[PDB]
Design an enzyme around this catalytic site. Structure first.
Site, PDB file in Angstrom:
ATOM      1  N   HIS A 200       0.808  -1.212   0.000  1.00 26.34           N
ATOM      2  CA  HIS A 200       0.000   0.000   0.000  1.00 26.34           C
ATOM      3  C   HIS A 200       0.841   1.261   0.000  1.00 26.34           C
ATOM      4  O   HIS A 200       0.302   2.347  -0.217  1.00 26.34           O
ATOM      5  CB  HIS A 200      -0.934   0.020   1.199  1.00 26.34           C
ATOM      6  CG  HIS A 200      -2.070  -0.941   1.084  1.00 26.34           C
ATOM      7  ND1 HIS A 200      -2.951  -1.181   2.117  1.00 26.34           N
ATOM      8  CD2 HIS A 200      -2.474  -1.723   0.056  1.00 26.34           C
ATOM      9  CE1 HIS A 200      -3.849  -2.069   1.729  1.00 26.34           C
ATOM     10  NE2 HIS A 200      -3.579  -2.417   0.484  1.00 26.34           N
ATOM     11  N   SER A 204      -0.401  -1.141  -6.324  1.00 21.92           N
ATOM     12  CA  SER A 204      -0.704  -2.474  -6.825  1.00 21.92           C
ATOM     13  C   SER A 204      -0.118  -2.668  -8.218  1.00 21.92           C
ATOM     14  O   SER A 204       0.735  -1.910  -8.685  1.00 21.92           O
ATOM     15  CB  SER A 204      -2.209  -2.713  -6.825  1.00 21.92           C
ATOM     16  OG  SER A 204      -2.722  -2.712  -5.507  1.00 21.92           O
ATOM     17  N   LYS A 226     -16.222  -8.233  -4.308  1.00 22.29           N
ATOM     18  CA  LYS A 226     -15.561  -9.223  -5.155  1.00 22.29           C
ATOM     19  C   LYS A 226     -14.821 -10.273  -4.322  1.00 22.29           C
ATOM     20  O   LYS A 226     -14.894 -11.477  -4.606  1.00 22.29           O
ATOM     21  CB  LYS A 226     -14.620  -8.500  -6.113  1.00 22.29           C
ATOM     22  CG  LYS A 226     -14.021  -9.346  -7.213  1.00 22.29           C
ATOM     23  CD  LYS A 226     -13.312  -8.439  -8.210  1.00 22.29           C
ATOM     24  CE  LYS A 226     -12.795  -9.184  -9.425  1.00 22.29           C
ATOM     25  NZ  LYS A 226     -11.638 -10.062  -9.103  1.00 22.29           N
ATOM     26  N   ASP A 227     -14.157  -9.846  -3.251  1.00 16.94           N
ATOM     27  CA  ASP A 227     -13.451 -10.781  -2.390  1.00 16.94           C
ATOM     28  C   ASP A 227     -14.392 -11.552  -1.479  1.00 16.94           C
ATOM     29  O   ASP A 227     -14.064 -12.666  -1.071  1.00 16.94           O
ATOM     30  CB  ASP A 227     -12.405 -10.044  -1.562  1.00 16.94           C
ATOM     31  CG  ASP A 227     -11.271  -9.520  -2.409  1.00 16.94           C
ATOM     32  OD1 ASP A 227     -11.019 -10.109  -3.481  1.00 16.94           O
ATOM     33  OD2 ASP A 227     -10.624  -8.533  -2.004  1.00 16.94           O
ATOM     34  N   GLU A 270       3.044 -34.771   3.528  1.00 11.02           N
ATOM     35  CA  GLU A 270       1.883 -34.345   2.766  1.00 11.02           C
ATOM     36  C   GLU A 270       2.338 -33.747   1.435  1.00 11.02           C
ATOM     37  O   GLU A 270       3.507 -33.396   1.257  1.00 11.02           O
ATOM     38  CB  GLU A 270       1.052 -33.364   3.604  1.00 11.02           C
ATOM     39  CG  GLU A 270      -0.355 -32.998   3.094  1.00 11.02           C
ATOM     40  CD  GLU A 270      -1.299 -34.175   3.016  1.00 11.02           C
ATOM     41  OE1 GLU A 270      -1.122 -35.134   3.795  1.00 11.02           O
ATOM     42  OE2 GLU A 270      -2.222 -34.140   2.177  1.00 11.02           O
TER      43      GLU A 270
HETATM   44  C1  HEM Z   1       1.931 -15.320   3.821  1.00  9.72           C
HETATM   45  C2  HEM Z   1       0.972 -15.344   2.915  1.00  9.72           C
HETATM   46  C3  HEM Z   1       0.665 -14.130   2.163  1.00  9.72           C
HETATM   47  C4  HEM Z   1      -0.328 -13.273   2.419  1.00  9.72           C
HETATM   48  C5  HEM Z   1      -1.327 -13.391   3.528  1.00  9.72           C
HETATM   49  C6  HEM Z   1      -0.255 -12.261   1.445  1.00  9.72           C
HETATM   50  C7  HEM Z   1      -1.173 -11.225   1.457  1.00  9.72           C
HETATM   51  C8  HEM Z   1      -1.216 -10.319   0.443  1.00  9.72           C
HETATM   52  C9  HEM Z   1      -2.188  -9.338   0.318  1.00  9.72           C
HETATM   53  C10 HEM Z   1      -3.332  -9.149   1.275  1.00  9.72           C
HETATM   54  C11 HEM Z   1      -1.912  -8.629  -0.795  1.00  9.72           C
HETATM   55  C12 HEM Z   1      -2.730  -7.454  -1.262  1.00  9.72           C
HETATM   56  C13 HEM Z   1      -3.938  -7.822  -2.103  1.00  9.72           C
HETATM   57  C14 HEM Z   1      -3.377  -8.277  -3.409  1.00  9.72           C
HETATM   58  O1  HEM Z   1      -2.984  -9.551  -3.554  1.00  9.72           O
HETATM   59  O2  HEM Z   1      -3.273  -7.492  -4.313  1.00  9.72           O
HETATM   60  C15 HEM Z   1      -0.733  -9.162  -1.356  1.00  9.72           C
HETATM   61  C16 HEM Z   1      -0.132  -8.719  -2.507  1.00  9.72           C
HETATM   62  C17 HEM Z   1       1.061  -9.222  -2.999  1.00  9.72           C
HETATM   63  N1  HEM Z   1       1.772 -10.230  -2.517  1.00  9.72           N
HETATM   64 FE1  HEM Z   1       1.270 -11.323  -0.935  1.00  9.72          FE
HETATM   65  N2  HEM Z   1       0.762 -12.478   0.614  1.00  9.72           N
HETATM   66  C18 HEM Z   1       1.363 -13.604   0.989  1.00  9.72           C
HETATM   67  C19 HEM Z   1       2.450 -14.249   0.450  1.00  9.72           C
HETATM   68  C20 HEM Z   1       3.143 -13.690  -0.583  1.00  9.72           C
HETATM   69  C21 HEM Z   1       4.280 -14.238  -1.139  1.00  9.72           C
HETATM   70  C22 HEM Z   1       4.958 -15.496  -0.715  1.00  9.72           C
HETATM   71  C23 HEM Z   1       4.675 -13.407  -2.138  1.00  9.72           C
HETATM   72  C24 HEM Z   1       5.845 -13.619  -2.986  1.00  9.72           C
HETATM   73  C25 HEM Z   1       7.030 -13.227  -2.553  1.00  9.72           C
HETATM   74  C26 HEM Z   1       3.740 -12.352  -2.212  1.00  9.72           C
HETATM   75  C27 HEM Z   1       3.844 -11.332  -3.115  1.00  9.72           C
HETATM   76  C28 HEM Z   1       2.845 -10.394  -3.266  1.00  9.72           C
HETATM   77  C29 HEM Z   1       2.862  -9.400  -4.326  1.00  9.72           C
HETATM   78  C30 HEM Z   1       3.931  -9.264  -5.374  1.00  9.72           C
HETATM   79  C31 HEM Z   1       1.749  -8.665  -4.176  1.00  9.72           C
HETATM   80  C32 HEM Z   1       1.319  -7.504  -5.039  1.00  9.72           C
HETATM   81  C33 HEM Z   1       0.672  -7.977  -6.347  1.00  9.72           C
HETATM   82  C34 HEM Z   1      -0.034  -6.856  -7.067  1.00  9.72           C
HETATM   83  O3  HEM Z   1       0.481  -5.621  -7.082  1.00  9.72           O
HETATM   84  O4  HEM Z   1      -1.075  -7.065  -7.636  1.00  9.72           O
HETATM   85  N3  HEM Z   1       2.808 -12.547  -1.235  1.00  9.72           N
HETATM   86  N4  HEM Z   1      -0.335 -10.210  -0.573  1.00  9.72           N
END
Ligand code: HEM
Ligand code: HEM
Lengths: 378, 73, 55, 100, 89
Positions: A200, A204, A226-227, A270
């Site tokens: 944020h 995005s 949507k979510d 698993e």
């Molecule tokens: C631990 C579990 C994870 C949670 C709960 C989590 C949660 C979130 C949330 C809430 C967002 C914002 C909403 C969205 O997807 O646009 C986000 C975005 C993002 N996450 Fe995660 N995330 C997790 C794991 C990861 C992992 C492992 C990566 C890779 C390194 C990652 C990379 C990203 C990226 C690159 C975005 C931005 C994508 C965009 O701009 O559309 N996330 N994540």
């Protein structure tokens, strides 16, 4: 004027959930973040009810799990929700990472690194959980991965003597695993807040990779509804899976007491660790195998530093797109080779698939990237 | 990253939008959406298939090799 | 006919929430009886109420 | 040469012609490209933002424009190349002045 | 009601605005309304008629929006609609 713009908490909620400028482009592939968050708190809730009915004594752990599934009211639905909600948790984790790679959102450094630290924490947490029921497969897989930690000379021998509590997996190892499984999702929640904070702060992405700073839309009530639609879909999937064949993924062999002498021959953890397990046994070395596991997740670290295409996305580079889907099929190949024991055709194609994994992600993405750089008059 | 307002500088644009109540939920859903999803299907599956069909054939071939090792013995 | 129902029970949001709670317990009653009738219909015979009535 | 046919088939099947996006439209933006986008005349900037806003609408609804409004390889109007050249040459000038 | 009285009286000033009101009244209404009829219809409304008319015309309807200029920080149309009706917010 309003509470929402003058109150110190609703400033933060207004800048996170309401006045967040969302791109008006994202498909259902972007739904997996909120689904990971809801699965995370649902795992916290079901595990907390499990914690209100659990006795971590190793002689009575198996009976305790039995009494949960039998005589505690609805203990069977709470336990089955916890286990298969962990399963759908890792499914939404893989779709989240696959989104963040294939749609090129890995240009961001720090959010990606925080995500990888989250990956380490969730993998260790899920393993500690899988050890907790103190069954046959749990006990022997615990012994296996403890010995893989013991594989390092001079640095980790006293480390594994330290995490043993003694000679082997004794009762003290079980209480250590209960405590770390019982705390680490809160560290996961905090690092998820930092993940969300850097996102944020930067902003995005969108399917095209074009910066969408001309078409921002508010977050509510578009992506909130949507979510919630994604949440109802996830809930129907998880409830079909836990109300028709709840043994669709979990091992049948893990429902015996921990016979500390057997090691049944069809040993595997698993399914979600099995491709990470598959890179191990398809490399003919102890230390090379454990270092190659570590280097697999460190390849997931390295991958933003190998981008040499002058686009952001892979929506417009179809040759790199073909190579990435080859990597997808190789992932599920490694999953199935992890799903089967060591035999000679499986040895052949296991070495094949692991070498192709490393050679695609280390080497082939810059090669197709420089092909796409030259090929469009750049 | 921040809120609205201070993002870009765009002149020369006029946008039309209609209230959601006046419009139907599904104006010609099946009569357009099924050619649309077949078009999105046709535009991608030749980029999707050559990993997965090769994976399925390698799966069946290695399956046959292991089974054939377990056919004579 | 839909507009008459909007005129009756969709305007003041307090009475709106109260009447959809009333409809929710209405739906509780109808849904439990529907589920019980359907599940007993697909398991006519092999249910304990039959054998207990014969005991 | 046949490599012109390679590039022509590739631009024909490379996606962004179908939405109405030229060669100068799907650029990754480090700080150099942001300098290049700043260094632009006004009407060309306006044509760029109108194509981008239409492309965001099309990729939202997953709808693709008719055959009459695609851009062909005969008419690939590229304009962002000289500004990108100048910013890269200035960054290499700063690198030379630090490594001189 | 007091502002309506004083503003309508000062609106009926001179001869040109008054005769403009005459022409516009004899087109639409078919007649010119006397000022005593205006004052009578002013006194014929209290708070009950006001809250009923605001209930009919303002409360939970479908407006039309025209924005011109630096209007990016205008909320989108669904924000206007979900702010149009109260669940007491
Ligand atoms: C631990 C579990 C994870 C949670 C709960 C989590 C949660 C979130 C949330 C809430 C967002 C914002 C909403 C969205 O997807 O646009 C986000 C975005 C993002 N996450 Fe995660 N995330 C997790 C794991 C990861 C992992 C492992 C990566 C890779 C390194 C990652 C990379 C990203 C990226 C690159 C975005 C931005 C994508 C965009 O701009 O559309 N996330 N994540
Ligand atoms: C912090 C909240 C949590 C608590 C209090 C908790 C507690 C427990 C307990 C007591 C068990 C043993 C019961 C059993 O094995 O059936 C367990 C198992 C397990 N937990 Fe958690 N857990 C929590 C969160 C999570 C999370 C976030 C995950 C990862 C998604 C997870 C993954 C697992 C797994 C995989 C098992 C093994 C299920 C099995 O083998 O039977 N837990 N948890």
């Amino acid at each position: 004027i309003n509470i929402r713009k003058t109150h110190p908490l609703m400033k933060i909620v207004n800048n996170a959930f309401i006045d967040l400028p969302a791109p008006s482009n994202i498909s259902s592939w972007w739904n997996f973040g909120s689904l990971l968050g809801i699965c995370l708190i649902l795992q916290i809730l079901t595990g907390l009810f499990l914690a209100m009915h659990y006795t971590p004594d190793t002689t009575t752990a198996f009976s305790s799990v039995t009494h949960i599934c039998r005589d505690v009211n609805y203990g069977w639905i709470i336990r089955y929700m916890h286990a298969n909600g962990a399963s759908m948790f890792f499914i939404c984790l893989f779709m989240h990472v696959g989104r963040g790679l294939y749609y090129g959102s890995y240009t961001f450094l720090e959010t990606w690194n925080i995500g990888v630290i989250l990956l380490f924490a969730t993998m260790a947490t899920a393993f500690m959980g899988y050890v907790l029921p103190w069954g046959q497969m749990s006990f022997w897989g615990a012994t296996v991965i403890t010995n893989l930690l013991s594989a390092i000379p001079y640095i980790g021998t006293n480390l594994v003597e330290w995490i043993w509590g003694g000679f082997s997996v004794d009762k003290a190892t079980l209480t250590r695993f209960f405590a770390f499984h019982f705390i680490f999702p809160f560290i996961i929640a905090a690092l998820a807040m930092v993940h969300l904070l850097f996102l944020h702060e930067t902003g995005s992405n969108n399917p095209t990779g074009i910066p969408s700073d001309t078409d921002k839309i508010p977050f509510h009530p578009y992506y909130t509804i949507k979510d919630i639609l994604g949440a109802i879909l996830l809930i129907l999937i998880l409830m079909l899976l836990v109300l028709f064949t709840p043994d669709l993924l979990g091992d049948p062999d893990n429902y015996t007491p921990a016979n500390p002498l057997n090691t049944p021959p069809h040993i595997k953890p698993e399914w979600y660790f099995l491709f990470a397990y598959a890179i191990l046994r398809s490399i003919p070395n102890k230390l090379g195998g454990v270092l190659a596991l570590v280097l697999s997740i460190l390849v997931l670290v390295i991958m933003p530093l190998l981008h040499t295409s002058k686009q952001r996305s892979m929506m417009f580079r179809p040759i790199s797109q073909c190579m990435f889907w080859i990597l997808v099929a190789d992932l599920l190949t490694l999953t199935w080779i992890g799903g089967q024991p060591v035999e000679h055709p499986y040895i052949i194609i296991g070495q094949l698939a692991s070498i192709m994994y490393f050679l695609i992600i280390l080497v082939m993405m810059p090669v197709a990237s420089i092909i796409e750089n030259n090929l469009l008059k750049w | 990253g921040r809120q609205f307002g201070h993002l870009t500088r765009v002149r020369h644009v006029i946008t039309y939008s209609l209230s959601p109540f006046e419009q139907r939920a599904f104006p010609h859903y099946f009569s357009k959406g099924i050619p649309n999803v077949l078009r999105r299907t046709r535009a991608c599956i030749l980029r999707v298939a050559p990993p997965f069909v090769v994976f399925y054939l390698v799966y069946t071939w290695g399956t046959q090799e292991f089974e054939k090792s377990k056919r004579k013995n | 006919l839909t507009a008459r129902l909007y005129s009756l029970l969709f305007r003041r949001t307090s009475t709106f929430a109260l009447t959809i709670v009333v409809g929710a317990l209405f739906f509780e009653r109808a849904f439990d009886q529907g589920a019980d009738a359907i599940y007993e219909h697909i398991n006519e015979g092999k249910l304990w109420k039959h054998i207990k009535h014969k005991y | 040469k046949w490599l012109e046919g390679i590039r022509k088939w590739y631009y024909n099947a490379a996606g962004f012609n179908k939405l109405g996006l030229m060669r100068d439209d799907t650029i990754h933006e480090n700080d150099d490209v942001k300098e290049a986008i700043r260094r632009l005349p006004e009407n060309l900037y306006n044509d760029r933002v109108f194509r981008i806003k239409r492309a965001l609408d099309l990729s939202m609804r997953q709808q693709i424009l008719p055959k009459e409004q695609w851009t062909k390889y005969e008419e690939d109007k590229f304009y962002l190349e000289p500004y990108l050249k100048e910013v890269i040459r200035e960054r290499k000038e700063r690198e030379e002045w630090t490594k001189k | 009601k007091n502002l309506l009285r004083n503003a309508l009286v000062s609106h009926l000033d001179g001869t040109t605005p008054v005769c403009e009101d005459i022409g516009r009244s004899l087109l639409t209404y078919g007649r010119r309304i006397p000022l005593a009829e205006w004052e009578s219809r002013i006194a014929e409304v209290d708070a009950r008629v006001v809250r009923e008319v605001c209930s009919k015309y303002f409360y939970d309807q479908c407006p039309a929006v025209a924005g011109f200029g630096p209007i990016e920080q205008l909320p989108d149309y669904n924000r206007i609609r979900s702010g149009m009706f109260w669940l007491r917010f």
